[PDB]
Amino acid sequence: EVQLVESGGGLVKPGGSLRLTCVASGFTFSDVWLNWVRQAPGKGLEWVGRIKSRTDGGTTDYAASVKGRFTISRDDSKNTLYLQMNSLKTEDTAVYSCTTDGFIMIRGVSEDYYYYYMDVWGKGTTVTVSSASTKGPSVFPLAPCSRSTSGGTAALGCLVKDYFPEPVTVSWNSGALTSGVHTFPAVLQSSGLYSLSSVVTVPSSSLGTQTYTCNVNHKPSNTKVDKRVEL
Partner 1 sequence: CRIHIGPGRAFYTC
Partner 2 sequence: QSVLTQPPSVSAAPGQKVTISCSGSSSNIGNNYVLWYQQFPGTAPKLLIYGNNKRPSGIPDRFSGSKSGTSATLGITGLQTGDEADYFCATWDSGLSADWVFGGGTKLTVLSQPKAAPSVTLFPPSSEELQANKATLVCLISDFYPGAVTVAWKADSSPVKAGVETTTPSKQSNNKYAASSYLSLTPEQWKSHRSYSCQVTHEGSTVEKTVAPTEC
Contact between 209 and partner 2 per CB under 8 A: no
**CA 181 distance to own-chain centroid:** 24
Among 9, 12, 95, 140, binds partner 2 (CB under 8 A): 140
Minimum CB separation of residue 52 from partner 1 in Å reads: 7
Closer to partner 1 at the Cβ: 43 or 107? 107
161 and 186 in contact (C-beta within 8 Å)? no
Scanning 71-79, 85-93, 177-185, 216-224 for contacts with partner 2 by CB under 8 A, the matching segment is: 177-185
Scanning 20-28, 193-201, 206-214, 216-224 for contacts with partner 2 by CB under 8 A, the matching segment is 193-201
d(CA 105, CA 123): 27
Measured distance CA(17)–CA(69) in Å, rounded: 9
Question: HSE-up of 227 (CA within 13 Å, CB side)?
Answer: 24
CA atoms within 13 A on the CB side of 119: 16
The CA distance from 22 to 99, in Å, is 9
Candidate list 30, 54, 61, 131; residue touching partner 2; CB under 8 A: 61
For residue 46, the minimal CB distance to partner 2 (Å) is 7
Find all residues with CB under 8 Å of 180, minimum gap 6, and list them.
200, 201, 202
Footprint on this chain of partner 1 (rule: CB under 8 A): 33, 50, 52, 61, 101, 103, 110-117
225 binds partner 2 (CB under 8 A): no
Establish how many alpha carbons lie within 13 A of residue 74's alpha carbon, considering only the half-sphere containing its beta carbon.
25
We find the least distance from the C-beta atom of residue 70 to partner 1, in angstroms, to be 17
Cβ(84)–Cβ(71) below 8 Å:
yes
Which parts of 142-171 interact with partner 2 (CB under 8 A)?
A: 142-146, 155, 157, 159, 161
CB 37 within 8 A of CB 100: no
Instruction: Choose between 55 and 211: whose C-beta lies nearer to partner 1.
Output: 55
- Smaller CB distance to partner 1: residue 31 or 61? 61
Complex with partner 1: residue 52 or 227, whichever CB lies closer = 52
Distance CA 91, CA 50 (A): 20
What residues make contact with partner 2 under the rule CB under 8 A? Answer: 35, 37, 42-47, 61-64, 104, 115, 117-119, 121, 123, 138, 140-146, 155, 157, 159, 161, 182, 184-185, 187-190, 195-197, 199, 201
